Design a protein around this nucleic acid. Structure first.
Ligand SMILES: [K+]
Ligand SMILES: [K+]
Ligand SMILES: [K+]
Ligand SMILES: [K+]
Ligand SMILES: [K+]
Ligand SMILES: [K+]
Ligand SMILES: [K+]
Ligand SMILES: [K+]
Ligand SMILES: [K+]
Ligand SMILES: [Mg+2]
Ligand SMILES: [Mg+2]
Ligand SMILES: [Mg+2]
Ligand SMILES: [Mg+2]
Ligand SMILES: [Mg+2]
Ligand SMILES: [Mg+2]
Ligand SMILES: [Mg+2]
Ligand SMILES: [Mg+2]
Ligand SMILES: [Mg+2]
Ligand SMILES: [Mg+2]
Ligand SMILES: [Mg+2]
Ligand SMILES: [Mg+2]
Ligand SMILES: [Mg+2]
Ligand SMILES: [Mg+2]
Ligand SMILES: [Mg+2]
Ligand SMILES: [Mg+2]
Ligand SMILES: [Mg+2]
Ligand SMILES: [Mg+2]
Ligand SMILES: [Mg+2]
Lengths: 206, 151, 82, 127, 99, 101
RNA sequence: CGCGAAGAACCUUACCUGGUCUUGACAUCCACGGAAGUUUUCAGAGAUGAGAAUGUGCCUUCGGGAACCGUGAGACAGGUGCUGCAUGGCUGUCGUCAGCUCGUGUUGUGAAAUGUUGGGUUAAGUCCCGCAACGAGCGCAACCCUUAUCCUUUGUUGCCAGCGGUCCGGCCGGGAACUCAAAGGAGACUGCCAGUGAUAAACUGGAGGAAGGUGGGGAUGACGUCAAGUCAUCAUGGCCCUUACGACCAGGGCUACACACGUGCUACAAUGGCGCAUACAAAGAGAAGCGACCUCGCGAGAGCAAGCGGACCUCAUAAAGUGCGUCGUAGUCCGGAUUGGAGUCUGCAACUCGACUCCAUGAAGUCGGAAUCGCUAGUAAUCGUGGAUCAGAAUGCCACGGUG
């Protein structure tokens, strides 16, 4: 069968939104496009900076972007010149004046985006997918995660028939709405096609 | 109905008379949720049954109802691709239900003008044991006696 | 129908009939304007109306006034099934 | 003093004020025969007041909003029964047996996606 | 006069901490305040097809709730005006105030 | 959805804002019921076709902003129903949670 | 098979006929010449080809740099072209069916088995006993939303019980009771009482209660199956096209019509048709928008123009129903297909090919062969209302209440 998106089913119960602005119907679609262009830019520029989450908030005619990252000295740059030439180009895109804040991810191996792109980077480095999956599962469980499962899909090891292989440890109750599930997705573009990665990380209830 | 064997829903009595069997009769007459239309048809038919052909109104209604109620009907029973017709006694809840259903369907396929006068003729035919609602009763009784050997 | 405050005709067709009005009978006028209405000013001309692939000549008679030019050029060819 | 009740049926809501003594029932500043043309709606608003006997003993001032004919008449009957149990409180246990104390919670079921109605499915064909 | 203040937001926790901020800024500055009242919440529904190609009967249904709060103010002092124009509100509350 | 189809769309709305909502005067003012009902109305009906075959908001297909999909559009978000759903589950549209009533 | 398509006159549009372009309709980099915009000029079906007017932002750290236009040469752009049997993502389906497994131990040469079977029980691999198994995971249940009862808080744009007044309309003074609005809290657990049961788990019944045994409905879809669906949402490996399989324009087409099938709508009437009078809803939408009052039109509509970003204004006088009159069982005062004439509105434009109005026309159809579908209660049946898409254009889809 097909599953529900575990972040989408938990909005307003245990997981918050990544955008926290208000609009009427006139200004709604243009705030949504400019949020798309700001997120598209920061993903491409900070690709080697391990960015997990981009929270956009808009007060009255402002914008402030909070970049959750595991590696904050490289998004900051040498005492703060890299975030200016981030906010001299974000306010370019949004039109409104901009502010950039940066939040440190303490344990980057309990973050489902950072685990998914770590597996994705190894699959493009020509690493066997079992090692990439099993090291990611062991590293998160040894840090106190209550459960994890990873899953890769599509032409594994250059095989000509695609497969979906997954590996679970711990406890991942996807039907429980109190469950703090961190889920994300990444794609790896290799010489034989696209390999999709999915990571679920459980951290406790309520 | 495999597992959850149920009770039953309780219904209102008739407003003009205090009858729950007339409330069942208006329900069987009712088409597409039109209860107000169906009470006017029964009350029109019950008046012209009472005033033209002998009074004691709902006393006359059950005199017509007694004469169409069956006492034994037939039911299939599948064994091996040859399925017998076994006579079974009719429950008295089902007795009133079959009698009122046969009268409404008899009164539907007439040629008179109103529905109330088709109903009035069928109740006056049934009070004197004629018509076609009575003949549905003995056709069931003929078939029940025909398969009497399979008791 | 279109409402009573102005029949429709294109301008390139309106000018082209105007110069066939004074300068006389010509070759049939090639047009693509099937949506134009037939005026009094066009009786006697032959308008070749486009129908998708060809230009069908239409000799304008007095009963064609107030109709469209596209009505005298069938766009679908069909003759029997089997 | 006025003794009060609130009753509701499907989408109707009725407030009921009872006053000590006579047989006047007035509903939305009209009386019963002017408001409810249907005899069935007249009887179910009468119904709580014949188990308790009130010849002409209680004036009833009632207003109602929403729903239709049978919805308003059931919302009145539930509002009367709550006003009479405020009125003396010995009436409850025979009013329980008559089923008038129960709020009828039967609401209209919502239309569902893929279905023509709440439960009506489109016509199936094997091929 | 009276000054009337309308608050709308997508969240109800965030909107009534915002009303609690402006009911207590306004008699800390010493004005009678009227309300706050909750106006009816307008919910807008959407219904999409989830499959990229066919399968018409497989759908999702979504909703946006817009909560509304109304505060009227009885005693608009000079101190009241400069208090609640310069307040620290969140990014989700929209304010539109009436003279 | 075919780069040229979007460029046809981008050019259509930019050329629609070029003329109309500014010079809709040619039909909203002169083709009126009073003394302009003489030849000046008729020249206005002729003048309306000098403007390009675009210019009119009735040729906006109103596609999705990311993929350019012409069907399944939602005017509230500007995105197609595939991209509305894909970004709502990611938590990107504010206040958009799954409805259950 | 009313499926993608939540809405093909042009556009959309991917197809056809014809007219046209070749570093390009869309992007980056180089060189040179022009600041962008303005607004008219004649040809042409249009794309495309020919004059006037003009800007000069900006620091020049004075060579010019930054926006926008044209031309030139290349890397390149572009492809709704092929392969869903190379893929990602997403979706259908068995099926909301109660299942599907693992660790360690034990048994078997082994594939494997046990656990997960057995006695009961449950909606449930649900729970309790027994037992070479002891534990665990994904499912089940619960946590979430809504509906049914009460309490607290707040009281307008919502409300009117007690009051004063009134033009008799909550409309004014006023009231904070009630309806309602939306935040918080309470309530239902087989909790209580009998009986049955293996001193069990659980069943039948009763009390109380708004609600009783999963209270109603929704969301939620395990491991997997069908090389199931989608390269035409997007993304993507390989292949193919590169003065064309790319790009622009006009007109046509997707609406053809001997036929067959699927899903619907309206009927074949008297439980009805028509005429007049008169009750009772919910849920929604609205600024290139919803548009009242009044005047004109038989009408669709038009003119004028208030209010409303909205519990305030508008869409918007619900229909079935009820009362009276008429028709009197007919191919009809049933049915409203088809066609003729005259119009309205939207739009550059209603010929192909829009919706609606008026007058006239008044086919088939009298309950449907073999066969077949849906539904267990506020359900079926029937009656209206709203929304998305949308300039205009629902008998479809998604929602809402009435009767029942
Ligand atoms: K696939
Ligand atoms: K084992
Ligand atoms: K491909
Ligand atoms: K066409
Ligand atoms: K249909
Ligand atoms: K059919
Ligand atoms: K047309
Ligand atoms: K007729
Ligand atoms: K429309
Ligand atoms: Mg209904
Ligand atoms: Mg369907
Ligand atoms: Mg359009
Ligand atoms: Mg089918
Ligand atoms: Mg076309
Ligand atoms: Mg098993
Ligand atoms: Mg076993
Ligand atoms: Mg279990
Ligand atoms: Mg066991
Ligand atoms: Mg569950
Ligand atoms: Mg209070
Ligand atoms: Mg296949
Ligand atoms: Mg074209
Ligand atoms: Mg078609
Ligand atoms: Mg109106
Ligand atoms: Mg007949
Ligand atoms: Mg069932
Ligand atoms: Mg009907
Ligand atoms: Mg509808």
């Amino acid at each position: 069968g097909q599953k529900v998106h575990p972040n989408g089913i938990r909005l307003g119960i245990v997981k918050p939104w990544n955008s926290t602005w208000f609009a009427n119907t006139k200004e709604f679609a243009d705030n949504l496009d400019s949020d798309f262009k700001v997120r598209q830019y920061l993903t491409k520029e900070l690709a080697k900076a391990s960015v997990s989450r981009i929270v956009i908030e808009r007060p009255a005619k402002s914008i402030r972007v909070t970049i959750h990252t595991a590696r904050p000295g490289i998004v900051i740059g040498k005492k703060g010149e890299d975030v200016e030439k981030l906010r001299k180009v974000v306010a370019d895109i949004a039109g409104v004046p901009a502010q950039i804040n940066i939040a440190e991810v303490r344990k980057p191996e309990l973050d489902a985006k950072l685990v998914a792109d770590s597996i994705t980077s190894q699959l493009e480095r020509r690493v066997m997918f079992r090692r990439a999956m099993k090291r990611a599962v062991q590293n998160a469980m040894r840090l106190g995660a209550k459960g994890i499962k990873v899953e890769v899909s599509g032409r594994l090891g250059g095989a000509e028939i695609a497969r979906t292989e997954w590996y679970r440890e711990g406890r991942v109750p996807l039907h429980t709405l109190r469950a703090d599930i961190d889920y994300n997705t990444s794609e790896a573009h290799t010489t034989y096609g696209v390999i999709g990665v999915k990571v679920w990380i459980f951290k406790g209830e309520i | 109905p495999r597992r959850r064997v149920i009770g039953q829903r309780k219904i209102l009595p008739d407003p003009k008379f205090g009858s729950e069997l007339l409330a069942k009769f208006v329900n069987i007459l009712m088409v597409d949720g039109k209860k107000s239309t169906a009470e006017s048809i029964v009350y029109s038919a019950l008046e012209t049954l009472a005033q033209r052909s002998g009074k004691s109104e709902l006393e006359a209604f059950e005199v017509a109802l007694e004469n169409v109620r069956p006492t034994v009907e037939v039911k299939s029973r599948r064994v091996g691709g040859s399925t017998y017709q076994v006579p079974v006694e009719v429950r008295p809840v089902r007795r009133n239900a079959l009698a009122m259903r046969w009268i409404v369907e008899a009164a539907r396929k007439r040629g008179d003008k109103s529905m109330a006068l088709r109903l009035a003729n069928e109740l006056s035919d049934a009070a004197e044991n004629k018509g076609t609602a009575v003949k549905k009763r003995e056709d069931v009784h003929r078939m029940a006696e025909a398969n009497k050997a399979f008791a | 129908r279109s409402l009573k405050k102005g029949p429709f005709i294109d301008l390139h067709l309106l000018k082209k009939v105007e110069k066939a009005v004074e300068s006389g009978d010509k070759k049939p006028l090639r047009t693509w304007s099937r949506r134009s209405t037939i005026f009094p000013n066009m009786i006697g001309l032959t308008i070749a109306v486009h129908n998708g692939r060809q230009h069908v000549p239409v000799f304008v008679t007095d009963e064609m006034v107030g109709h469209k030019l596209g009505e005298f050029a069938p766009t679908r060819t069909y003759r029997g099934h089997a | 003093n006025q003794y009060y009740g609130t009753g509701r049926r499907k989408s109707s809501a009725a407030r009921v004020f009872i006053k000590p003594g006579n047989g006047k029932i007035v509903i939305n500043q009209r009386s019963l025969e002017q408001y409810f043309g249907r005899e069935t709606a007249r009887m179910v608003v009468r119904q709580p007041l014949e188990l308790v006997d009130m010849v002409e003993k209680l004036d009833l001032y009632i207003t109602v909003k929403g729903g239709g004919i049978s919805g308003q008449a059931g919302a009145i009957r539930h509002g009367i029964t709550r006003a009479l149990m405020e009125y003396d409180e010995s009436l409850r246990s025979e009013l329980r047996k008559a089923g008038f104390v129960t709020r009828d919670a039967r609401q209209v079921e919502r239309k569902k996606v893929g279905l023509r109605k709440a439960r009506r499915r489109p016509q199936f064909s094997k091929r | 006069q009276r000054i009337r203040i309308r608050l709308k937001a997508f969240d109800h926790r965030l909107i009534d901490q915002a009303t609690a901020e402006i009911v207590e800024t306004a008699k800390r500055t010493g004005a009678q305040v009227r309300g706050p009242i909750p106006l009816p919440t307008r919910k807008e529904r959407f219904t999409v097809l989830i499959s990229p190609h066919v399968n018409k009967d497989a759908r999702d249904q979504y909703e946006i709730r817009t909560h509304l709060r109304l505060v009227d103010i009885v005693e608009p002092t000079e101190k009241t005006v400069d208090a609640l124009m310069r307040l620290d509100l969140a990014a989700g509350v929209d304010v539109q105030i009436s003279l | 959805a075919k780069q040229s189809m979007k460029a046809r769309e981008v050019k259509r709305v930019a050329l629609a804002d070029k003329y109309f909502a500014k010079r809709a005067e040619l039909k909203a003012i002169i083709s009126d019921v009073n003394a302009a009902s003489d030849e000046d109305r008729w020249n206005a009906v002729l003048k309306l076709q000098t403007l390009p075959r675009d210019s009119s908001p009735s040729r906006q297909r109103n596609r999705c902003r990311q993929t350019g999909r012409p069907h399944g559009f939602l005017r509230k978000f500007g995105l197609s129903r595939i991209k509305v759903r894909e970004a709502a589950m990611r938590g990107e549209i504010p206040g958009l949670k799954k409805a259950s009533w």
